[PDB]
């Protein structure tokens, strides 16, 4: 009781200090300015809701003795939130439940008491037509149930809480969704709950009847609103279709839903990456690396970014497949350095011409590549090792025996050492001829490449590109 | 003081990085660590050291003496303000903060040096304060703070001549441009070797002669080595005391190619154990090999590859794999043949190789400004 | 020593002599502008990147 009564009594009110200022300012705003007048294309309540997801990601950790959040639920759920003269008593009810935690004891919600914390939208003239309240009054309890996820006989409490929000989601899909942004501000509440709808299901449940419900969700999308409904319903469509073998990739080629034209700078950034791996996994190399690069330089400024630990790995998988390689550790971190050393040792073998050096990696770190889920692209680098090597040898040696190149590439056979060189010319790596009767492979010396048209093609790509950024500097300037 | 202060940073390198050689280095530094009132810069060095379990009274006898010099500053600051000179509080510890720069860390130095920077109306104390900020910014490798005060140094020398503050300064960039891999600047900052004085950091002038010759054989070709460092009496007589480095320079000049690799093996071994070249010792010889190869190879056209074994360096297959990786590197303009055993050269024009470096920088600046305009304006 | 330029042959001693002032003015005096302009975009960080 002294170790309790000095360390337990400040966890109730100082969260009550900041929760009368963040979602009470959201409840004070997004009931009267999302159901109210307007929250326009330049709104604040979405970014305010962006402020009330991230803060509560790392806010709550403990099972909430002293009712420091276990008493917030009997406070924040007895809410009509209809109009100002009936919420002037509710502005007292933000303080009337504070002494319920203090003078008395509330109901400590420890893994059992969430069932009398969900049935309240009948109590004291509550509604569901005001879904700028009730979609947020879903998400204000729907987040902290599932934020820790706590995975011990809880899943049904998360489910029935989603079912009441799914009842709000059907009223979203059918009933009066126009110019109140009832779809728009709840497409985020659709999108943000889907990740809590998935990590439940990616933990212990199925995946696929939600997909047909998501097709029914994609049905009404772009069918009433063409803003942030075309965007988040397609990355959340793709998120396990890539990991499944279902058709889902040539569908997304001819699909019209490729461009929502705006997706709020962070869901748009990874959007070019989930379809960036689709061209990577189905052999479309050169088209992929520009939507892989564009999916990199549109991401914000966080540090614990473990998906960015994957895109920097994957972006130069396909560039090893094309030949080009940048320095990958050019932004090396204390958390990037350990995530590069097996994969950086791979591209060490690619810039060399050795053949079973590839085999000395693929037995040492063959298990690591299957953890990242990338092995099926790794296995085909032996075509690109041998074309790197045959370009390397033919440029160095001019008149080399074909019964010498195989011993240097440890090919163990001169009789197909002619044959890779045949496919080197069929692909077009080296030009010159082979004296198959003698055995030497002669190469012609290069000639005046300066007086060829091809450096103008190095220019014309970049003349037209540099006039574009001068035009974009004009088009983005005179907003005043 | 900061005048014997650079040998400490060399001996910290001598402590940690030679892993077996960590016994006499932890003794002779501790010979100087737990004397002359040093407190701060060796806690993690003691962590890289052994236990040394009883250092508590070893610290307490010294942090007291740190306080003793600090409290007589606390007894100075009221007797200097009562009957004032030129702010003699500051003016006392504008010489005693460099003690506190050595003894404490940079924070006691930086708040006292920028204090006393505004005191003296003449640069003759200001520009000597700036040399202190340069020298600690080498110890803590403050590569972003040296860029500030070097311009703030150089902005002071133009009024007056200040050649004992200019020729002194040129050694600092000369050690900084060789700290970074920028050798054509380092030989240019080491261009004089005449006004370069018997300094504190290279206490042997002859060690400075070794540093200015090791960088000079990279940066310039041989219309200039055959005029400057073969004919300078200021540079000949100081390596006249050196048997190795005289032979190391002249073997490239005399075309004694076989004995060139012999002393190069000594220097590259020495360059490994030397401080401040050990970040780039593997970069050195691979540039000095390709400098040695192309000098012999651009005299002839029809040279056979087995002529270079007994006259340039032994091992025919050693020549084979080494030239194979440098033509494949895109340098060393020749084209080796294999099965008639000859090396044929070419001469490419100075357009394509001059074109090649232009397309590098054009991509890099376009990489810079495209990435910039995405960050700004959302 | 580049006081004269040419090539020497080893088999029979043939000195193929050639000459051209190739070009120097056009490219490297336009190349150093690029690294001047790189430092200008670096100095844009001290009034834009810090500021807005």
């Amino acid at each position: 009781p002294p170790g309790g009564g000095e360390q337990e009594p400040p966890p109730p009110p100082a969260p009550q200090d900041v929760e009368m200022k963040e979602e009470a300012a959201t409840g004070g705003g997004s009931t009267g300015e999302a159901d109210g007048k307007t929250a326009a294309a330049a709104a604040e309540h979405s970014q305010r809701e962006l402020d009330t997801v991230t803060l509560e990601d790392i806010k709550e950790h403990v099972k909430q003795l002293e009712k420091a959040v276990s008493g917030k639920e009997p406070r924040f759920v007895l809410r009509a939130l209809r109009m100002l003269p009936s919420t002037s008593r509710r502005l007292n009810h933000y303080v009337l439940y504070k002494a319920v935690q203090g003078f008395f004891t509330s109901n400590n919600a420890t893994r059992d008491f969430l069932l009398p914390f969900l049935e309240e939208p009948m109590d004291t003239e509550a509604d569901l037509q005001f879904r700028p309240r009730t979609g947020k009054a879903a998400s204000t309890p729907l987040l902290p149930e599932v934020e820790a996820y706590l995975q011990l006989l809880v899943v049904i409490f998360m489910m029935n809480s989603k079912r009441y929000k799914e009842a709000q989601k059907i009223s979203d899909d059918l009933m009066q969704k126009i110019s109140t942004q009832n779809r728009r501000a709840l497409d985020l509440v659709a999108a943000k709950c889907y990740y809590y709808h998935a990590r439940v299901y990616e933990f212990l449940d199925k995946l696929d009847v939600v997909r047909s419900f998501l097709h029914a969700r994609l049905r009404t999308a772009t069918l009433r609103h063409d803003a942030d409904g075309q965007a988040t319903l397609l990355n959340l469509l793709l998120r396990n279709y890539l990991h499944y073998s279902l058709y889902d990739q040539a569908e997304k080629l001819v699909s019209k839903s490729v461009f929502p034209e705006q997706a709020n700078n962070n869901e748009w950034a990874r959007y070019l990456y989930y379809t960036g791996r689709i061209k990577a996994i189905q052999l479309e190399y050169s088209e992929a690396r520009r939507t892989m690069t564009n999916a990199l330089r549109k991401a914000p400024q966080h540090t614990a970014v473990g998906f960015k630990q994957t895109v920097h790995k994957l972006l130069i998988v396909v560039e090893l497949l094309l030949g080009e390689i940048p320095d990958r550790l050019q932004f090396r971190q204390p958390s990037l350095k350990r995530s590069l050393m097996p994969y950086f040792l791979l591209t060490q073998a690619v810039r060399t011409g050795n053949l079973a050096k590839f085999n000395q990696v693929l037995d040492q770190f063959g298990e690591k590549f299957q953890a990242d889920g990338t092995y099926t692209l790794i296995i085909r680098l032996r075509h690109n090792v041998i074309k790197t090597g045959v370009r390397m040898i033919s440029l160095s040696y001019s008149r080399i025996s074909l019964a010498d190149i195989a011993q240097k590439l440890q090919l163990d056979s001169p009789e197909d050492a002619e044959f890779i060189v045949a496919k080197a010319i069929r692909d077009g790596v080296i030009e010159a001829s082979i004296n198959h009767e003698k055995g030497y492979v002669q190469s012609k010396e290069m000639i005046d490449i300066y007086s060829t048209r091809e450096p103008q093609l190095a220019f014309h790509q970049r003349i037209s590109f540099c006039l574009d950024i001068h035009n974009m500097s004009v088009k983005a300037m005179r907003f005043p | 003081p900061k005048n014997p202060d650079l040998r400490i940073a060399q001996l910290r390198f001598l402590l940690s990085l030679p892993e077996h050689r960590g016994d006499a280095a932890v003794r002779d530094e501790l010979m100087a660590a737990v004397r002359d009132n040093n407190m701060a810069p060796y806690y993690e060095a003691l962590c890289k050291s052994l236990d040394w379990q009883i250092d508590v009274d070893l610290l307490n006898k010294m942090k007291k003496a740190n306080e003793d010099e600090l409290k007589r500053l606390d007894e100075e600051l009221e007797d200097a303000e009562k009957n004032l000179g030129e702010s003699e509080i500051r003016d006392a510890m504008m010489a005693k903060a460099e003690y506190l720069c050595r003894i404490g860390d940079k924070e006691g130095a930086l708040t006292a040096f920028r204090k006393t920077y505004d005191k003296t109306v003449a640069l003759g104390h200001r520009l000597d304060i700036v040399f202190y900020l340069l020298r600690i910014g080498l110890f803590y490798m403050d590569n972003d703070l040296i860029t500030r005060n070097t311009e703030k140094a150089k902005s002071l020398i133009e009024e007056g001549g200040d050649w004992d503050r200019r020729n002194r300064l040129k050694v600092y960039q000369g050690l900084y441009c060789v700290a970074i891999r920028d050798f054509k600047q380092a030989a240019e900052l080491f261009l004089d070797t005449v006004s370069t004085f018997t300094s504190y950091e290279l206490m042997d002038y002859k060690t400075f002669v070794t540093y200015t010759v090791y960088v000079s054989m990279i940066a310039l070709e041989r219309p200039d080595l055959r005029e400057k460092v073969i004919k300078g009496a200021e540079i000949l007589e100081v390596l006249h005391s050196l048997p190795a480095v005289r032979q190391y320079l002249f073997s490239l000049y005399e075309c004694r190619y076989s004995v060139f690799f012999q002393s190069l093996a000594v220097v590259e071994q020495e360059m490994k154990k030397d401080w401040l070249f050990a970040p780039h010792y593997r970069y050195y010889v691979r540039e000095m090999r390709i400098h040695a190869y192309s000098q012999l190879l651009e005299s002839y056209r029809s040279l056979t590859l087995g002529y270079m074994a007994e006259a340039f360096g032994v091992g025919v297959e050693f020549i084979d794999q080494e030239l194979s990786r440098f033509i494949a590197a895109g340098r060393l303009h020749c084209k080796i043949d294999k099965v008639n055993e000859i090396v044929e050269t070419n001469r490419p024009d100075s357009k394509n190789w001059q074109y090649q470096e232009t397309i590098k920088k054009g991509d890099l600046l376009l990489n810079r400004v495209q990435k910039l305009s995405r960050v700004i304006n959302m | 020593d580049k006081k004269f330029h040419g090539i020497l042959d080893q088999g029979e001693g043939v000195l193929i002599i050639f000459d051209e002032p190739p070009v120097d003015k056009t490219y490297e005096a336009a190349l150093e502008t690029i690294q001047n302009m790189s430092k200008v975009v670096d100095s844009l960080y001290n009034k834009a990147k810090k500021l807005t």
């Binding site: 003349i463 006039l467 | 304006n377 | 975009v41």
Partner: peptide, 30 residues
Amino acid sequence: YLASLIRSVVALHNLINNKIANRDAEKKEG
């Protein structure tokens, strides 16, 4: 190619010259 490269940098320096006159007056004037 050099002259067009200059054209992009100059208007970018002009772009900050409008972002100095956009943000530094909305708090001042309103």
